[PDB]
Amino acid sequence: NQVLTKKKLQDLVREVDPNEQLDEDVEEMLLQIADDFIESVVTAACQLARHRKSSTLEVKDVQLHLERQWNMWIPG
Amino acid sequence: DPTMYEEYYSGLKHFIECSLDCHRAELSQLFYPLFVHMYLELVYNQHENEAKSFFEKFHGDQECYYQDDLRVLSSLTKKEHMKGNETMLDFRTSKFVLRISRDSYQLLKRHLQEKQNNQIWNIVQEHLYIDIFDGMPRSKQQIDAMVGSLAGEAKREANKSKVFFGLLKQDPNAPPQNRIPLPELKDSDKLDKIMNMKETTKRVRLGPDCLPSICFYTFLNAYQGLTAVDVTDDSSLIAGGFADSTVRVWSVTPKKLRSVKQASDLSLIDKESDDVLERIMDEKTASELKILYGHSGPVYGASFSPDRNYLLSSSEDGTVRLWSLQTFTCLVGYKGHNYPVWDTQFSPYGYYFVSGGHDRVARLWATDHYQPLRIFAGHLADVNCTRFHPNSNYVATGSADRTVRLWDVLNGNCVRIFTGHKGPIHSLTFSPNGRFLATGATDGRVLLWDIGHGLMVGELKGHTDTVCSLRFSRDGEILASGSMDNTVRLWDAIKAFEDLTATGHINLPENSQELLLGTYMTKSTPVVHLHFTRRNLVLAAGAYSPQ
Amino acid sequence: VASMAGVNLSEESARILATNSETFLLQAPLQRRILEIGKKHGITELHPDVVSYVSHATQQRLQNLVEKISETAQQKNFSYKDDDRYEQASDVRAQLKFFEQLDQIEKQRKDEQEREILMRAQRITRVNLRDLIFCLENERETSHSLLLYKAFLK
Amino acid sequence: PKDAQMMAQILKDMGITEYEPRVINQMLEFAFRYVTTILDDAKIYSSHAKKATVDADDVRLAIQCRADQSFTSPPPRDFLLDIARQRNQTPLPLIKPYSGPRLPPDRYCLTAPNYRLKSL
Amino acid sequence: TPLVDFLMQLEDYTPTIPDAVTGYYLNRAGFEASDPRIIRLISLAAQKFISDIANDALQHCKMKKYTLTMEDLTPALSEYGINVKKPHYF
């Protein structure tokens, strides 16, 4: 059920600083923040998709919620 | 169901006003909670037009004390407007307590157990508790004295817990010394009580004859708005919390505020000397005023420690700050609220402190942990006031949902719920006996509560605007009240407590006129603080606002 | 990207040079995770390029937060006392230590009184929870949130 | 004015008798800022659904997706009572008798040597 | 240390904003005036922000110099990601 495997998160820190170690509390809170992000983004994207009268959840729907509420602008 | 709520409510409105007058005044209590629970259930099930029509037909038969809640409700017409209110969200899930007598409940249940009104009976037994007492039905001016809150007039089973309302050192109402782990009494703290009882030697007995002298310490310019005052227990320092995010300590004795010397200067002097504290003071830094910076918002709480170090301040930015008064810097920033902390106070023994904020809790801190120890989380609105008991085993938290609640420091349990104010409570004080509690709110009423019996013992209704400061005398002879009508009223706090149930109420006397010893008007100056010198001299502080 | 002179462009380009001056979510449990929230809206199936787009969106959410907490976890590892361009101004900790020494002298006097009564008878950077909390109350999201409010008690 | 006389009636319906004259001017400035960010997002959502007319479901979407981010609230009562009973179960710690000035650990206080640059 | 050198030069420099006014809005947020040079660097940073917005607005006015209008501040702050609002209610 866990989508972030707690070891790829440590590679997200090694790419920024080769000498840095998070605390176990910090790692668990970061995992909760990730889970919460996935849930909020998917719920709002699904609201945009129902709005577009669709049952498909295409990226256009996920990409629009990032640009308007989070300002991420991930290349599609 | 939803299109006939103006037929269910108007039928019960027709039954109650056609009753006999002894039971009519007590059965008028369920007009307000049945009006809100039917209105909020209409707007939660997305029936806006019917909700608006119900509000228009019945809002004006509601008691005058409920206008503020009625205006918040008139704004609420949608469901998503109410889904982010969090006060009407907790009102919809809780139960109105609605203390009624058994003589009037028999007429109510003989009008609801019949199928003719099985819908309004279904709303009553779903949304309303009914707490029955065996006794006389209360009068209308006695019901008016004890209602006014949302989810108000709480059960007697809450006000029956054993409360150790006595002072520490035999008193059977006193808690043991090892109940709450209070700090030790040092030799410098024992030296304070030696000169404290020299002040008690010159202390005058106030009473209704020897009325005290009031020394008003007005803030003259104060164009940054003064939001918090505190005075030390000996009248030596006066703190000021201001809207320009500053705390300003003033010395009122002829003794300038000095910081202690730097660490290089203390390393060359020796300890073990008799002078020591005198040796450490720096005379290069000596002012009649020290300004403290570091809050990013208007400082709302100000609290001295009883050893005259350790100023406390809370502000809009959500932090409580512990300022030293020996180095005159900030020491700790206590970040537990994300929201404006409206009040803070040190314990009268000086280790723990309680801070109440906009997030509807009051936290108990200890000046040793970055995290709180107790979270007092039962209020439905902002915790406006937070006051410690004189034994510091109990914390009284007044709030904006018109309730005052005592909280045991052990177990964090609410042991008393005091309802009967019509506005948000803006001042609390305890009697020096520990037996009584005076609360003031925006309705100008000072309600005197018993703590052992959990019963209000008197109502002082002289003030016009928000009563923002209360204090009892050092003996307990006089309660001083200061409000926004620029008056310092003095009340007889001995004749107000001359009598010490199972009906859960006492017949309040309507005796305010006999308990007013005097009213003194300030020149355009709201009385923010009231303090009693240990020789029983009233001190008051307020910014002069010409307005 | 929509703004050519955008202000968060210059932030994370100067933040990286400040840290230089000292996620890829699993595709199989994520695809079940999107579909269960889709039952509450009627979004019964999802596009095959979305479950890897949300994984790229979760990465740039946490990499924007890992970089943000790294530049405040290295804010505490700047020792001023090795440099001599800086001068010490106010050390409260040392004054407190002198006060503690005086308190210990008082305790020793108390012990002597008790004895008399008896006779009569390569810097490594570790990120704390403070560095994560500091990067939550500043950004607009998660400033008034139940995840930061609970983090004040963890 | 037209919209400024309605703003003095929203305040008087809330019982606000006394207010500064700059209070009406900046609640209108907030009300204008709020409607030009609902309708700005409404035509973004209309172009997502590919319709030339911004109809009422677009404004229903742009309101509830702006109220999900902008206007927050304090934590709810079932959340405050759960973190209370998780915190109020822990017993109060005892106090060391002569520890000194009672403070948190030094990484939680504001007591550091607090340096400054040499003037030269 | 280019900026440390600049701050050391900032003594004997008077900025366009006074330090009694820059220090007032710093004291409002908890920042207290320990060192004048730090107040002066903060004042100069604020000045650079306003000046850069103004210069971009002037390039827009020259393209469409002289009067600064809200329709010059609107595309000038749009590359900054700031949507400026017309009054429209007075």
How far apart, in whole angstroms, are the C-alpha atoms of residue B444 and residue B93?
31
Inspect the interface and report whether the beta carbons of B331 and D94 lie closer than 8 Å: no
Q: Is D1 helix (H, G, I), strand (E, B) or coil?
A: coil
Q: D114, C88 in Cβ contact below 8 A?
A: yes
Residue by residue, DSSP assigns B348-362 as: TTSS-EEEEETTS-E
Q: How far is CA C105 from CA B13, B24, B189, B274, C116, in A?
A: 76, 73, 16, 12, 17
Inspect the interface and report whether the beta carbons of E80 and C85 lie closer than 8 Å: no
Q: Is B81 helix (H, G, I), strand (E, B) or coil?
A: helix
Number of domains, chain D: 1
In the numeric block, the tokens 């206007």 are attached to: D71
How far apart, in whole angstroms, are the C-alpha atoms of residue B373 and residue B395?
13
Q: Which of D106, D111, D114 sits opposite C89 (nearest CB)?
A: D114
DSSP secondary structure letter of residue B61 = G
DSSP H helices, B223-344, are 263-268, 277-280
Query: What phi-psi label fits residue B245: left (phi over 0), alpha (psi between -120 and 50 degrees) or beta?
Result: left
Q: Which helix (H) or strand (E) holds D47?
A: helix D21-49
Say if residue B265 is exposed, middle or buried (CB neighbours under 10 Å; 0-12, 13-18, 19+).
middle
**Method used to determine the 3D structure:** cryo-EM
CA distance B333 to chain E (A): 13
In the numeric block, the tokens 């990207």 are attached to: C1
Inspect the interface and report whether the beta carbons of D61 and A51 lie closer than 8 Å: yes
Q: Which helix (H) or strand (E) holds B223?
A: none
In 3-state terms chain A splits into helix, strand, coil percentages (rounded to 5) of: 65, 5, 30
Scan residues 76-135 of C and list those with Cβ closer than 8 Å to B.
90-92, 94-95, 97-99, 101-102, 105-106, 133
- Which residues, at least 6 apart from D118, have a Cβ–Cβ distance to it below 8 Å? C84, C85, C86, C87
Q: B365, B389 in Cβ contact below 8 A?
A: no
Q: Which domain holds residue D25?
A: 1-120
How far apart, in whole angstroms, are the C-alpha atoms of residue B435 and residue B394?
12
Q: A9, C21 in Cβ contact below 8 A?
A: no
In the numeric block, the tokens 């002829």 are attached to: B254
Here the tokens at position C76 are 């505490």
DSSP H helices, B366-441, are none
Q: How far is CA B13 from CA B6, B16, B61, B147, B172, in A?
A: 10, 5, 10, 19, 49
How far apart, in whole angstroms, are the C-alpha atoms of residue B357 and residue B385?
9
Say if residue B432 is exposed, middle or buried (CB neighbours under 10 Å; 0-12, 13-18, 19+).
middle
How far apart, in whole angstroms, are the C-alpha atoms of residue B230 and residue B233?
9
Residues with their C more than 2.5 Å from the N of the next written residue in chain E, i.e. before a break, are 64
Here the tokens at position B24 are 């009519």
Closest CA to B354 of B325, B329, B320, B310: B320
Tell me which chains share at least 3 CB pairs under 8 Å with chain D. A, B, C, E
Here the tokens at position B51 are 């909700």
Q: Which residues of chain B have a CB within 8 Å of the CB of E27?
A: 244-246, 293
How far apart, in whole angstroms, are the C-alpha atoms of residue B44 and residue B51?
10
E-assigned strands of B387-477? 387-388, 394-398, 403-408, 414-419, 425-430, 436-441, 446-450, 456-460, 467-472
In the numeric block, the tokens 């020096």 are attached to: B432
How far apart, in whole angstroms, are the C-alpha atoms of residue B2 and residue B41?
9
Q: Is E28 helix (H, G, I), strand (E, B) or coil?
A: coil
Q: How far is CA E47 from CA E15, E18, E51, E61, in A?
A: 9, 11, 6, 21
In the numeric block, the tokens 């008056």 are attached to: B487
How far apart, in whole angstroms, are the C-alpha atoms of residue A69 and residue B375?
34
Q: Which helix (H) or strand (E) holds B332?
A: strand B330-335
Chain D positions touching chain B (beta carbons under 8 Å): 13-15, 64, 67, 71-77, 80-81, 83-85, 87-88, 90, 92-95, 97-98, 102-105, 108-111
- Which residues, at least 6 apart from E13, have a Cβ–Cβ distance to it below 8 Å? E40
How far apart, in whole angstroms, are the C-alpha atoms of residue D111 and residue D97?
22
Query: What phi-psi label fits residue B380: left (phi over 0), alpha (psi between -120 and 50 degrees) or beta?
Result: alpha
Q: Amino acid identity of B335?
A: K
Q: Which residues of chain C have a CB within 8 Å of the CB of B339?
A: 144
Q: Are strands B414-419 and B425-430 parallel, antiparallel or unpaired?
A: unpaired
Q: Maximum CA pair distance of chain E?
A: 51
Q: Are strands B362-365 and B516-521 parallel, antiparallel or unpaired?
A: unpaired
Closest CA to B401 of B422, B415, B416, B386: B422
The torsion angles phi and psi of B449, rounded to 5 degrees, stand at -110, 140
Q: Maximum CA pair distance of chain B?
A: 91
CB count, 10 Å around CB of B348?
Answer: 17
Here the tokens at position B407 are 């909280």
Inspect the interface and report whether the beta carbons of E81 and C4 lie closer than 8 Å: no
- Which residues, at least 6 apart from B361, have a Cβ–Cβ distance to it below 8 Å? B337, B375, B376, B377, B379, B383, D80, D84
Q: Order of strands across the sheet with B529-532?
A: B214-219, B538-543, B529-532
Per-residue buried b or exposed e for B280-301, using 16+ beta carbons within 10 Å of the residue's own CB: beeeebeeeebebbbbebbbbb
Say if residue B179 is exposed, middle or buried (CB neighbours under 10 Å; 0-12, 13-18, 19+).
middle
Residue by residue, DSSP assigns chain C as: ---TT-HHHHHHHHHHHHHHT-----HHHHHHHHHHHHTTTT--S--TTTHHHHHHHHHHHHHHHHHHHHHHHSSTT--TTT-SSEEE---HHHHHHHHHHHHHHHHHHHHHHHHHHHHH--PPEEE-HHHHHHTTSSSSTTSSSHHHHHHTT-
- Which residues, at least 6 apart from B246, have a Cβ–Cβ distance to it below 8 Å? B224, B291, B292, B293, B295, B299, E27
Contacts made by residues C37-41, CB under 8 angstroms, sequence distance 24+: C37/A39, C37/A42, C37/A43, C37/A46, C38/A42, C38/A46, C38/A57, C40/A43, C40/A46, C41/A43, C41/A46, C41/A47, C41/A49, C41/A50
How far apart, in whole angstroms, are the C-alpha atoms of residue A30 and residue A36?
10
Number of residues that this document lists for chain B: 547
CB count, 10 Å around CB of B116?
Answer: 11
Q: Amino acid identity of B312?
A: L
Per-residue buried b or exposed e for E10-35, using 16+ beta carbons within 10 Å of the residue's own CB: beeeebebebeebbeebbbebbeeee
CA distance D48 to chain C (A): 17
Q: B530, B510 in Cβ contact below 8 A?
A: no
Q: Is D101 helix (H, G, I), strand (E, B) or coil?
A: coil
Inspect the interface and report whether the beta carbons of C153 and B186 lie closer than 8 Å: no
Nearest-10 Cα torsion for B188, B190, B196, B197: -150
Q: How far is CA D78 from CA B76, B97, B378, C80, E2, in A?
A: 22, 19, 10, 47, 54
Inspect the interface and report whether the beta carbons of B293 and E30 lie closer than 8 Å: yes
Q: Maximum CA pair distance of chain D?
A: 76
Q: B414, B155 in Cβ contact below 8 A?
A: no
Q: Which of B358, B374, B410 sits opposite D87 (nearest CB)?
A: B374
Here the tokens at position B400 are 């904006």
Here the tokens at position A63 are 């990409």
| Helices (runs of H) and strands (runs of E) counted in chain A | 3, 1
How far apart, in whole angstroms, are the C-alpha atoms of residue C5 and residue C64?
19
Q: How far is CA C62 from CA A15, A36, C12, C68, D59, in A?
A: 12, 12, 13, 9, 32
CATH for the B4-158 domain, from 3.90.870.30, 3.40.950.10, 2.130.10.10, 3.10.129.10: 2.130.10.10
Q: B227, B298 in Cβ contact below 8 A?
A: yes
Q: Which residues of chain D have a CB within 8 Å of the CB of B68?
A: 15
How far apart, in whole angstroms, are the C-alpha atoms of residue D72 and residue D70?
6
Q: How far is CA C122 from CA A11, A13, A17, B125, C126, in A?
A: 19, 17, 12, 70, 13
Residue E79's Cα: distance from chain center in Å?
A: 17
Q: How far is CA B344 from CA A56, B30, B360, D6, in A?
A: 54, 36, 14, 39
Per-residue buried b or exposed e for D33-56, using 16+ beta carbons within 10 Å of the residue's own CB: eeeeebeebbebbbebbeeeebee
Q: B388, B398 in Cβ contact below 8 A?
A: no
Here the tokens at position C98 are 């002198």
Residues with their C more than 2.5 Å from the N of the next written residue in chain C, i.e. before a break, are 22, 121
Q: Which of D32, D40, D116 sits opposite E88 (nearest CB)?
A: D32
Tell me, yes or no, if C21 comes closer than 8 A to chain E by beta carbon.
Answer: no
How far apart, in whole angstroms, are the C-alpha atoms of residue B276 and residue B326?
14
CB count, 10 Å around CB of B397?
Answer: 25
Q: How far is CA B375 from CA B360, B362, B397, B413, B529, in A?
A: 10, 6, 12, 10, 27
DSSP secondary structure letter of residue B329 = S
N-to-C CA span, chain E: 51
Q: Is B221 helix (H, G, I), strand (E, B) or coil?
A: coil
Tell me which chains share at least 3 CB pairs under 8 Å with chain C. A, B, D, E
Tell me, yes or no, if B405 comes closer than 8 A to chain D by beta carbon.
Answer: no
Closest CA to B132 of B150, B106, B152, B113: B106
Question: Is the sign of the CA dihedral E66, E70, E71, E77 positive or negative?
Answer: positive
Q: Which helix (H) or strand (E) holds D68?
A: none
Inspect the interface and report whether the beta carbons of C85 and E1 lie closer than 8 Å: yes
Strand partners, B237: B251
Q: Which residues of chain E have a CB within 8 Å of the CB of B246?
A: 27
Q: Which residues of chain D have a CB within 8 Å of the CB of B383?
A: none
Question: Is the sign of the CA dihedral D75, D77, D82, D83 positive or negative?
Answer: positive
DSSP secondary structure letter of residue B263 = H
The torsion angles phi and psi of B349, rounded to 5 degrees, stand at -105, -10
User: Could you write out the three-class secondary structure of B3-20?
Assistant: HHHHHHHHHHHHHHHCCC
Say if residue A25 is exposed, middle or buried (CB neighbours under 10 Å; 0-12, 13-18, 19+).
middle
Tell me, yes or no, if B296 comes closer than 8 A to chain E by beta carbon.
Answer: yes
CA distance C90 to chain A (A): 31
Inspect the interface and report whether the beta carbons of E27 and B296 lie closer than 8 Å: no
How far apart, in whole angstroms, are the C-alpha atoms of residue E39 and residue B269?
36
Inspect the interface and report whether the beta carbons of D13 and B372 lie closer than 8 Å: no
Scan residues 52-91 of C and list those with Cβ closer than 8 Å to E.
85, 89
Q: How far is CA B259 from CA A56, B282, B289, B350, in A?
A: 70, 6, 12, 21
In the numeric block, the tokens 């949507």 are attached to: E83
Strand partners, B250: B238, B289
Q: Is B485 helix (H, G, I), strand (E, B) or coil?
A: coil
How far apart, in whole angstroms, are the C-alpha atoms of residue B532 and residue C142?
45
Here the tokens at position C15 are 């933040």
E-assigned strands of A1-76? 20-22
How far apart, in whole angstroms, are the C-alpha atoms of residue C104 and residue E37?
42
